[PDB]
Design a protein around this ligand. Structure first.
Ligand SMILES: CCCCCCCCCCCCCCCCCC(=O)OC[C@H](COP(=O)([O-])OCC(O)COP(=O)([O-])OC[C@@H](COC(=O)CCCCCCCCCCCCCCCCC)OC(=O)CCCCCCCCCCCCCCCCC)OC(=O)CCCCCCCCCCCCCCCCC
Ligand SMILES: CCCCCCCCCCCCCCCCCC(=O)OC[C@H](COP(=O)([O-])OCC(O)COP(=O)([O-])OC[C@@H](COC(=O)CCCCCCCCCCCCCCCCC)OC(=O)CCCCCCCCCCCCCCCCC)OC(=O)CCCCCCCCCCCCCCCCC
Ligand SMILES: CCCCCCCCCCCCCCCCCC(=O)OC[C@H](COP(=O)([O-])OCC[N+](C)(C)C)OC(=O)CCCCCCCCCCCCCCCCC
Ligand SMILES: CCCCCCCCCCCCCCCCCC(=O)OC[C@H](COP(=O)([O-])OCC[N+](C)(C)C)OC(=O)CCCCCCCCCCCCCCCCC
Ligand SMILES: CCCCCCCCCCCCCCCCCC(=O)OC[C@H](COP(=O)([O-])OCC[N+](C)(C)C)OC(=O)CCCCCCCCCCCCCCCCC
Ligand SMILES: CCCCCCCCCCCCCCCCCC(=O)OC[C@H](COP(=O)([O-])OCC[N+](C)(C)C)OC(=O)CCCCCCCCCCCCCCCCC
Ligand SMILES: CCCCCCCCCCCCCCCCCC(=O)OC[C@H](COP(=O)(O)OCCN)OC(=O)CCCCCCCCCCCCCCCCC
Ligand SMILES: CCCCCCCCCCCCCCCCCC(=O)OC[C@H](COP(=O)(O)OCCN)OC(=O)CCCCCCCCCCCCCCCCC
Ligand SMILES: CCCCCCCCCCCCCCCCCC(=O)OC[C@H](COP(=O)(O)OCCN)OC(=O)CCCCCCCCCCCCCCCCC
Ligand SMILES: CCCCCCCCCCCCCCCCCC(=O)OC[C@H](COP(=O)(O)OCCN)OC(=O)CCCCCCCCCCCCCCCCC
Ligand SMILES: CCCCCCCCCCCCCC
Lengths: 174, 115, 100, 168, 66, 341, 96, 51, 174
């Protein structure tokens, strides 16, 4: 629940420009996007895992959206029509937009990317591996073990055990 | 002792000498029970009472061994029980405090006369 | 949780049947309650873990949250029946579907 | 939160009337409905909608007569003399026995039941003035013998715990 | 003796038993091949996992070629 | 058990299911253990050459399946409201769990299936029904701290199991009504001390396990079969019939000891009225025990003439007379025991 | 109210199934069908409990297995009635 | 208009205890759509069940 | 709206099931009951697996029960009653009217669907029945599965023992 004591970011902070591209336009050029935004995505997702609070990593989300917007401006300035043809092929070629259905326009788009920015396409499993980075922010401390100074105590094994006085003391037995 | 300390009440000082039957009563009673059980078996099968003495000797040995083993287990059980009681008294000294001993010269009970 | 009476090796399979530790949002709270249920015991844990029991209870049972939601929904319909809330402005602005 | 949610000893005896009537008739209702629920299905089945309610009334209403007569007799005997005692409960038990005799058309049942309920009344009055309870909450509740921590026989290994007894 | 009777009267049971024994041998070979290398640490991981450099899971990350 | 190794398999799965039930730290594991125990105990108690054993198996099946479904229902409700395995404060769903457990155990007023089904059984399956099948519901009652419902069950069980056993002259239904009366002493000990309940259950199962062997060997399914039972010495029948005075709680026999430890633990825990109500109950149980004891205490009987030799098993009658000695002279082992400290 | 708006319904349907199980019917197989209905409503209530929790719905097949073995036990008891009687009338069985 | 109501608490009783004072727990799906019609709830929740 | 309709249909079929003497009326009523219960159970889980499993279970069970209908109580009279039809029709139209005039946000189930789970849940993006059915074959509870295999084998041994095949076929007045 959200109460008055919990702080929230204001409406002026969350009113920035967001990526409004469709799914086929995001899937086209998706492999070239992460080679340019590897640092922002990994930092944002690492601090989103451990911090687990949407108020934290807001500036990391701003950096992720700014990197994606800068990459899409760089795609838009040079050979926008090849990206349009690749996104149209990926939209219209299959239900699930698989890259294996049409690869000729993918080759033309990768040729234009290599001719313009000298960027190569990564392999098919570059982003699905475990990614290790060095983070600028410090790691959050591991929780200390809970302390219980008044626990339920038992008889310790080093306690002395003399024989019982008067035996069982229960109905004449000793 | 002018006070009744529970620590002094529970600590075995060693002035209680055990009886003559104290280490030996359980094995001889269990051996008598085993011999009587074998006698009762021989009586119900219409044998002579002292016919099969192999059963008598085996039942007596089983009884003496079980009596000695469970008497030892009883002794460590009672030792651990008094250790638990002593440790619980030292763990909470406020609920079991030292009480001053109060003689009959400071007590006015109500005597009950017949007439 | 309950206790095993006359516990044997046969309770080792049974003990991990239903618990909140497998990828649940509540289980850490449950783990904390189990911590004092290992420390204080099952009987002292009913009295000395009243804060940790209730957090897990309204975390997985969602009792207080759903009573809050049904008080928020009933007050709006009560204002509509009493005439304070107009029928055109009866519902507020909807959230985005990409939210939550 | 009503007059039905009242007890017999919420007030001193003789001070209140209607709460005592409602409470003692509530135990009479519970006993009569329970006995008639284990009666009309099990032995002497009425096989009708109306004789089932007739057997319900037959097993319920005389218990209301018992409860009302005992409570009114105890109230009259408490309001008559200044002191409260046991023989008020004894004569209330005799009044309930007379109600039993009016039920069963047998004077001998009425007396014997009057003596038994008078003995029950004087024992209950001894309970309420001496302070002891018939069914108390149990002070000593053994959940096991000695070494209940020490007889954990499990084959799986314990992972290290997240709690310590050490102060920070 | 009993193999000829089973191979004469119920030959599909004998062929299925041969197929099941081959499957048990291939399951043993597959488990031994999976646990001979670091099979628990798979090359491609489900979800988006990020490890810090001081994490003990960081140096276990493979660097193979696709 | 008898005549098949698959019955030994059914006993093995019976022990496995009951020990799965009582060791469960959740109600669902206890429920599935009760399912395993029910699965194990349907085929024993079924015999196609007996017309009434199948009806007894059907009565047991319907009673246990109704009681197991109510038990799972209220368990699911307890998990729905108070999300842990137990309940912090007692409520009505704990009473539904306790009532569904009391239908399994056979206590009053849910007792009615128990002696009506025991007429259809043999003696060994009767002994498995009223000793081992009362392990799993009675040990699950211990997790519930309810006093009024348990007290009503105790009072009703000791009243009915004493009164109800007077009418039947058949030994199986009489011993079933005796097991109902001894169930009330177990449930009265269940809310003061679990160890004292275990001791009363062990000695009650010991006395049941020695009284079954006298009836299983010689096939004594009726009261007058005891009067016609041939022994080669009347002093032997006089000694063999002392186990009913043991089960009646008469000192100095062995069965005075578990009743006595229940009475001692009840008076230490400040219960006196229901203890007095259980004093008047066990006199009636001793009264219908004495109608069996008419068959050996008068020392001479007008007996049937044609039978001349009595026959018994070797190992069964050998194991019977070990425990008959300990059911009479068992109070000499009062110094050996160390549970009660 | 919260117990009334959510999961109060299968308690009522389980009570109706219990009343169908114990009603005076001529045949045992109607009681077996009422057992199948109370298996269905216990499945509903157990499924509500196992779906408040995220990934603990694997238990919902075990209850199905123990319930099917209950139904198989009832069906084999219905076979064993024919080994002794000629019928499945509940009036035809021994009341004592 | 409700006198006993406080924002974010059930009549003054806090929903979550043993937590830091500035933490944020994720609210339930019903409180997120507590100010909306059934069309938004069926728009979000009934995605898989319709197609 | 569909959930409240399934509520009304389950209530009406439960009223019908409590009132039917004939075993085939109970069989058809529990057919439509298990259809409606299978759809309702599906609404609560992210995936639709256990509804399918429960439908295979409750169609494998009553397939046998019809053979026992035709072998025992094959000849029994159906009795249609106008009171039950009028009661079921009036209660059904009343609950459809009451469900139409009800707010469906308050009457909806609080159990989380596959789309009611938030976007940040990375466990929701996997295959839909993987993590739900995982613990059947994982290390802490494989032994319960072992116990279920042995329990089903013991069940089959019990069925073979108490249904003696060599005593002959079963019918009325055998
Ligand atoms: C009648 C009594 C008088 C008879 C006349 C003769 C005189 C006898 C001695 C009189 C003593 C003083 C009178 C008195 O008021 O005593 C109160 C007193 C009760 O104790 P208390 O101090 O009031 O408080 C007790 C608890 O602390 C607090 O108790 P509680 O409020 O928690 O109890 C809840 C109460 C609440 O009652 C109700 O809710 C019932 C009424 C509501 C309507 C129900 C309608 C039907 C159900 C609808 C459900 C929906 O329910 C019951 O008490 C149920 C009792 C059921 C008894 C039978 C159970 C059989 C069960 C079988 C199946 C299992 O003592 C007695 O009642 C004992 C006397 C009666 C037994 C005498 C036996 C003599 C034998 C010879
Ligand atoms: C708290 C909450 C819960 C409270 C619950 C309380 C209520 C239940 C208590 C039950 C107590 C009890 O035991 O009652 C027994 C008692 C005696 O039962 P009975 O009806 O005499 O005997 C029934 C036979 O034994 C039956 O024996 P049978 O097995 O031989 O009968 C054959 C059976 C055979 O039944 C079947 O095979 C089942 C068929 C079901 C589906 C039908 C679909 C039809 C589609 C068109 O036929 C029926 O049951 C008739 C069904 C007719 C069709 C119903 C259509 C509507 C429901 C649709 C459900 C959803 C399915 C849709 C389709 C799905 C497709 C995938 O029941 C009643 O008395 C019923 C209540 C009547 C109350 C009064 C009704 C209103 C007033 C009527 C008179 C108005 C006069 C106006 C005069 C105006 C001018 C003056
Ligand atoms: C009557 C038959 C049943 C009687 C049971 C109790 C008999 C007395 C007993 O065993 O006391 C134990 C006590 C044991 O106490 P103890 O002082 O010997 O202490 C030893 C106790 N252990 C071994 C546990 C450390 O026996 C005695 O005190 C002496 C008994 C002497 C013999 C009595 C025979 C009585 C025979 C009666 C036949 C009729
Ligand atoms: C008509 C039958 C009606 C039965 C009603 C039973 C009510 C009941 O038991 O209430 C619980 C009560 C519980 O009593 P209690 O002692 O626990 O009451 C104390 C209550 N507080 C703590 C609130 C002050 O049972 C009794 O009162 C039983 C009294 C028995 C009296 C007769 C004994 C002798 C019998 C003849 C020999
Ligand atoms: C035969 C069963 C032996 C073990 C029974 C057992 O542990 O009982 C509990 C106790 C010892 O267990 P304990 O020492 O772990 O304490 C009891 C605690 N529970 C039951 C929760 C585990 O034993 C007895 O009370 C004795 C039972 C046997 C009867 C005496 C004659 C032999
Ligand atoms: C799954 C697929 C099922 C396909 C067949 C559906 C049949 C629907 C019948 C609906 C009858 C409704 C009705 O009122 O019935 C009362 C009637 C009453 O009979 P009647 O003859 O009195 O009705 C005549 C009514 N008038 C006079 C108004 C025309 O009963 C039937 O119609 C018989 C129903 C038989 C149901 C058989 C079910 C078999 C199930 C097998 C599996 C389980 C074991
Ligand atoms: C030492 C004395 C111990 C006393 C304690 C009580 C003993 C009770 C008797 C035990 C022995 C017994 O049963 O003897 C019966 C036997 C009868 O003789 P019988 O064989 O019938 O005929 C003789 C002609 N052939 O009698 C005889 O043959 C005479 C036996 C004389 C000696 C008796 C004791 C010998 C056995 C050792 C002690 C056994 C204690 C058993 C206790 C059981 C109860 C706890
Ligand atoms: C509460 C404790 C009640 C204790 C009552 C003790 C006395 C007794 O049992 O009386 C029952 C009474 C006996 O009547 P009877 O001997 O036939 O005499 C005929 C002429 N008067 O019989 C009657 O008066 C009729 C039957 C009893 C009805 C009143 C007593 C009800 C007692 C509570 C029952 C609770 C539910 C029991 C369920 C049992 C299920 C098996
Ligand atoms: C001293 C206390 C213990 C006394 C025990 C013995 C006496 C029990 C009470 C009794 O028997 O009272 C007599 C009275 C007779 O009632 P009535 O119906 O006339 O007798 C029919 C005869 N077949 O019986 C009754 O009125 C029944 C009273 C109910 C309680 C009976 C308890 C036994
Ligand atoms: C621990 C468990 C010990 C017992 C294990 C039993 C496994 C086999 C169970 C079974 O169903 O075996 C089939 C049959 C048993 O005999 P059956 O035909 O069921 O009974 C006829 C008499 N009423 O058995 C046979 O026909 C095989 C011969 C007897 C069993 C030998 C192997 C188990 C030995 C133990
Ligand atoms: C029939 C006689 C039985 C007893 C024989 C003697 C046993 C003595 C006690 C057991 C040994 C104790 C050693 C400390």
């Amino acid at each position: 629940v959200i109460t008055n004591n919990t702080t929230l970011p204001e409406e002026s902070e969350l009113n920035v420009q967001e990526l409004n591209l469709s799914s086929a336009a995001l899937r086209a050029g998706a492999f070239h996007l992460g080679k340019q935004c590897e640092q922002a995505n990994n930092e944002f997702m690492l601090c989103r895992q451990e911090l687990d609070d949407p108020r934290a990593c807001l500036a990391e989300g701003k950096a992720v959206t700014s990197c994606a917007l800068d990459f899409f401006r760089k795609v838009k300035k040079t050979c926008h029509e090849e990206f349009t043809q690749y996104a149209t092929c990926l939209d219209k070629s299959s239900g699930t937009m698989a890259f294996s259905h049409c690869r000729k326009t993918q080759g033309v788009f990768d040729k234009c990317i290599k001719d313009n920015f000298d960027w190569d396409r990564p392999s098919y499993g570059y982003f699905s591996r475990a990614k290790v980075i060095q983070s600028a922010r410090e790691a959050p401390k591991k929780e200390e073990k809970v302390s219980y100074p008044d626990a339920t105590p038992g008889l310790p094994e080093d306690y002395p055990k003399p024989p019982a006085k008067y035996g069982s003391r229960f109905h004449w037995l000793e | 002792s002018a006070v009744n300390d529970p620590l002094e009440l529970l600590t075995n000082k060693g002035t209680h000498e055990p009886s003559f039957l104290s280490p030996i009563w359980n094995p001889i009673a269990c051996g008598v029970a085993g011999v009587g059980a074998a006698i009762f078996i021989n009586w119900g099968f219409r044998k002579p009472v002292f016919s099969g003495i192999q059963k008598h000797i085996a039942f007596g040995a089983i009884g003496v061994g079980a009596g000695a083993y469970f008497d030892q287990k009883r002794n460590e059980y009672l030792a651990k029980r008094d250790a638990v009681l002593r440790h619980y008294i030292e763990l909470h000294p406020d609920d079991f405090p030292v009480k001053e001993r109060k003689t009959y010269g400071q007590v006015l009970e109500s005597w009950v006369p017949v007439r | 949780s309950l206790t095993p009476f006359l516990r044997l090796p046969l309770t080792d399979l049974t003990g991990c049947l239903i618990n909140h530790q497998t990828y649940d949002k509540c289980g850490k709270f449950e783990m904390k309650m189990m911590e004092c249920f290992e420390a204080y015991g099952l009987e002292r844990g009913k009295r000395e873990c009243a804060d940790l029991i209730s957090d897990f209870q309204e975390c997985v049972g969602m009792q207080k949250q759903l009573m809050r939601f049904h008080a928020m929904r009933n007050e709006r319909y009560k204002q509509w029946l009493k005439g304070e809330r107009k029928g055109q402005e009866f519902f507020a602005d909807p959230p985005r579907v990409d939210a939550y | 939160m009503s007059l039905l949610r009242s007890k017999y000893y919420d007030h001193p005896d003789g001070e209140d009337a209607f709460g005592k009537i409602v409470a003692t008739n509530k135990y009479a209702v519970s006993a009569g409905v329970a006995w008639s629920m284990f009666d009309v299905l099990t032995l002497s089945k009425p096989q009708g909608y109306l004789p089932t309610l007739g057997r319900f009334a037959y097993n319920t209403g005389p218990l209301m007569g018992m409860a009302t007569a005992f409570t009114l007799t105890t109230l009259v005997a408490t309001n008559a003399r200044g002191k409260d005692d046991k023989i008020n409960y004894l004569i209330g038990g005799f009044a309930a026995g007379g109600v039993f005799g009016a039920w069963k058309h047998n004077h001998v049942a009425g007396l014997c039941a009057g003596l038994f309920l008078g003995i029950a009344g004087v024992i209950k009055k001894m309970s309420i003035e001496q302070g002891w309870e018939f069914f108390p909450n149990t002070p000593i509740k053994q959940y096991g013998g000695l070494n209940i921590a020490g007889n954990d026989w499990t084959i799986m290994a314990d992972p290290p715990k997240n709690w310590t007894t050490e102060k920070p | 003796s009993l193999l000829k009777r089973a191979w004469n009267e119920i030959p599909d049971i004998v062929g299925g038993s041969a197929l099941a024994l081959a499957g048990i041998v291939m399951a043993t070979i597959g488990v031994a091949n999976y646990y001979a290398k670091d099979g628990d640490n798979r090359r491609y991981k489900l979800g988006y996992v990020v490890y810090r450099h001081d994490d003990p899971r960081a140096l276990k990350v493979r660097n193979d070629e696709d | 058990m008898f005549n098949n190794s698959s019955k030994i398999l059914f006993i093995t799965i019976m022990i496995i299911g009951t020990l799965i039930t009582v060791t469960s730290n959740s109600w669902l594991g206890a429920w599935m253990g009760l399912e395993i125990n029910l699965l194990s105990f349907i085929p024993l108690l079924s015999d196609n050459n007996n017309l009434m054993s199948t009806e007894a198996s059907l009565k047991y099946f319907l009673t246990q399946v109704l009681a197991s479904t109510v038990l799972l229902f209220s368990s699911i409700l307890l998990m729905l409201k108070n999300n842990m395995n137990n309940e912090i404060n007692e409520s009505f769903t704990s009473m539904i769990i306790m009532s569904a457990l009391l239908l399994k155990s056979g206590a009053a007023p849910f007792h009615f299936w128990f002696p009506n089904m025991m007429e259809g059984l043999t003696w060994m399956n009767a002994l498995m029904l009223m000793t081992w099948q009362k392990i799993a519901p009675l040990m699950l009652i211990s997790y519930l701290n309810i006093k009024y419902l348990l007290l009503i069950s105790v009072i009703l069980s000791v009243i009915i199991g004493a009164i109800g056993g007077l009418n039947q002259t058949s030994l199986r239904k009489l011993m079933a009504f005796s097991s109902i009366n001894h169930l009330g002493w177990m449930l009265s000990s269940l809310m003061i001390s679990e160890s004292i309940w275990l001791i009363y259950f062990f000695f009650y199962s010991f006395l049941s396990f020695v009284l079954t062997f006298m009836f299983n060997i010689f096939k004594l399914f009726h009261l007058n079969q005891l009067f016609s039972w041939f022994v080669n010495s009347k002093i032997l029948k006089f000694t063999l019939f002392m186990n009913f005075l043991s089960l009646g709680g008469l000192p100095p026999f062995l069965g005075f000891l578990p009743k006595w430890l229940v009475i001692q633990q009840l008076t230490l825990c400040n219960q006196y009225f229901m203890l007095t109500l259980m004093m008047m109950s066990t006199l009636i149980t001793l009264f219908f025990y004495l109608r069996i004891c008419y068959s050996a205490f008068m020392m001479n009987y007008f007996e049937n003439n044609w039978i001349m030799k009595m026959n018994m098993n070797s190992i069964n009658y050998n194991m019977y007379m070990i425990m008959t000695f300990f059911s009479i002279f068992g109070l000499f082992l009062i110094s050996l025991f160390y549970f009660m400290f | 109210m919260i117990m009334i708006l959510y999961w109060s319904l299968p308690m009522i349907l389980f009570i109706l199934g219990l009343f169908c199980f114990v009603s005076n019917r001529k045949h045992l197989l109607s009681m077996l069908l009422s057992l199948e209905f109370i298996v269905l409503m216990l499945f509903f209530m157990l499924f509500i409990y196992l779906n408040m929790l995220n990934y603990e719905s694997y238990f919902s097949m075990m209850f199905l297995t123990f319930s099917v073995c209950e139904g198989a036990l009832g069906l084999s008891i219905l076979v064993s009635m024919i080994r002794t009687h000629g019928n499945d009338y509940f009036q035809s069985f021994s009341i004592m | 208009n409700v006198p006993g109501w406080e924002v974010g608490t059930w009549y003054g009783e806090p929903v979550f205890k043993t937590l830091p004072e500035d933490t944020l727990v994720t609210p339930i799906f019903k409180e997120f759509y507590a100010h909306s019609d059934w069309k938004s709830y069926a728009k979000r929740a009934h995605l898989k069940l319709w197609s | 709206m569909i959930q409240l309709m399934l509520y009304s249909l389950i209530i009406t079929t439960s009223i019908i099931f409590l009132n039917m003497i004939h075993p085939l009326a109970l069989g058809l009523t529990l057919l439509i009951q298990t259809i409606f219960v299978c759809l309702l159970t599906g609404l609560m889980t992210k995936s639709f697996w256990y509804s399918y499993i429960l439908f295979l279970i409750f169609l494998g069970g009553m397939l046998v029960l019809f053979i026992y209908v035709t072998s025992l109580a094959s000849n029994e009279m159906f009795n249609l009653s106008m009171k039950l039809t009028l009661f079921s029709s009036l209660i059904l139209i009343f609950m459809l009217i009451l469900s139409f005039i009800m707010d469906k946000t308050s009457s909806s189930l609080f159990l989380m669907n596959n789309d009611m789970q938030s976007i940040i849940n990375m466990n929701s993006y996997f295959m839909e029945n993987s993590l739900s059915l995982n613990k059947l074959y994982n290390f802490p509870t494989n032994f319960i599965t072992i116990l279920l295999m042995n329990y089903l084998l013991i069940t089959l041994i019990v069925i073979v023992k108490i249904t003696k095949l060599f005593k002959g076929p079963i019918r009325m007045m055998s």
